[PDB]
Symmetry: C3
Subunit: 221 residues, 3 copies
Amino acid sequence: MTGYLGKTTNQDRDVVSAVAQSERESVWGEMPGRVVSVSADGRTVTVQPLYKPKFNGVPTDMPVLQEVPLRQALMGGVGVTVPVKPGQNVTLRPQMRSMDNYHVEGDGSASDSRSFSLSDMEAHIAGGESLKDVIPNLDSENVHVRANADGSKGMKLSPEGKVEFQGPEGNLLDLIADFMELVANDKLQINYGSSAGTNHAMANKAAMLALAAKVRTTGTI
Amino acid sequence: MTGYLGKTTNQDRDVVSAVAQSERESVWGEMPGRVVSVSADGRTVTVQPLYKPKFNGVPTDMPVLQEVPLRQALMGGVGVTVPVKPGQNVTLRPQMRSMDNYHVEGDGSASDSRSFSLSDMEAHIAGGESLKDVIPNLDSENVHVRANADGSKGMKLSPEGKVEFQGPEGNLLDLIADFMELVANDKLQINYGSSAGTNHAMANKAAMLALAAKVRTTGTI
Amino acid sequence: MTGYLGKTTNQDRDVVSAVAQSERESVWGEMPGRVVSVSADGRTVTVQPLYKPKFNGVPTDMPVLQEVPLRQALMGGVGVTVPVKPGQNVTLRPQMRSMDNYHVEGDGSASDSRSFSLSDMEAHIAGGESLKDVIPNLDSENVHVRANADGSKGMKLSPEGKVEFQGPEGNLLDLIADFMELVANDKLQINYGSSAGTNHAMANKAAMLALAAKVRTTGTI
């Protein structure tokens, strides 16, 4: 810290800790950002941060970070994805060294030779949102996979192994169970003294059809 | 490093690299922590880190980190969740600058002007556990989703696309197949010379009821 | 930066910011890396990271990082996994301090007293691949989980809650719905004037068997 004791007989120690603290400022790190656009190929995002540096004691902003490498949790493509849309919140993380042409050519080495640049940011899905703005319905006991902001449509999975595919129609396991329970309760319908091979149908045909069409209406994305 | 050559004719180089080196000390980074408590909203965790500093040559503690923003891998709520419980291990990461009132007010800026404070740690789910303590049953070939510590209940999914919902009762696809196969082997039971519409029941009704109750007992969380 | 004004009357400011600059180089940060081998216990990976720092004006290579703690997105074992194989891309992160025997012993402090060592890298799924190399089929509207590099065999899950287990055989909800629709369209087959309890069978028995065997062939991993 600057000037422990006074004006202009500034200790040599002060003016050295001053350069160390200045260079410690200069390093980038984590910070939140709002997505502006998502590239059609789905790996680079036009990220508007949420941090401004300190300039003229006042808010200025650095430019919108462009062609920021979006980073889903995938190993060789095999992994999980989240549909990124404009207005979402990501976390910007700088690189030790730029990786310009490790991305432009794959053969991995950047342009000149530095450290920790602002043009070195990657966007990650965990670490961005604010505590003020609340995400509703945070399941606390069971693994939850969310397909909507409210987490009211997706997959729920229990320590015992219980499952829930809570889609639009309802609990898919339950609806299939309803179908098969009507089978295990079903009673064929007889029409006449007709012993030749004609016109027998299950008494509960309509509900079976209804559930059968429901499973496709909740199944064909 | 301090004192490359000796006592008190310490080179101006030594007493400058020592300052840069202490300021390099002072920065925080990634380190494991144990969850102490989890807020009801499910976003802030009381974390006791597992990194301790060095002080008076001796183990001392900096306090249990409080209202550490828990950060699941969600984007707009749409993502994956893990049920955080008191005793699990997270990885704590500091931020370049603090977000006091970026979390207290959403409008994004903290109090005075620092870098890299210990009060800037976010907790992430990956990066905390120790290699001594072994996580059993690490599926190596198929993408595995777990709902238990032993990884014996959940969703297993193969490169070919094979699926397994290994719940309490067993492979749900197998149990649904054990239902469909009994229908495809089914043989209706005829009662009397009764050609009016009465008392026809599927011969394998009891087992279809059994599988039907199984699918709800493994489906209604 | 070095020498703002010239040869050998180098300002005291220059030869101090140069020390700060060098010590700012020395710190490690992220970098992409290639998996070489994966330990049988499934938590440590032999990694050949794709970065060389600058040596003798030229590529030299810092050696294959060993017993690098692999870090899946789990807490207590409960979480998601990706099958790590030799040749995939991870991102590395060093810590503020090494954790030698917080992994050798789980009691939590490494050997001497440092900061920020090369020997302290955790490997993480997200952040490693190059933008040149394209990961195909990035589902951009629905939560997608993959079991193959092409993202063509896995599970898709929509904001409305629609589901798709696109396995080798096809949409599992579609195939189960095909089964239920043929039951709800089925019409028992009569054999003779046989009113005693014999030989009645489903009219569409063969297709019901086909679907029933399909679900096991897509279900038993």
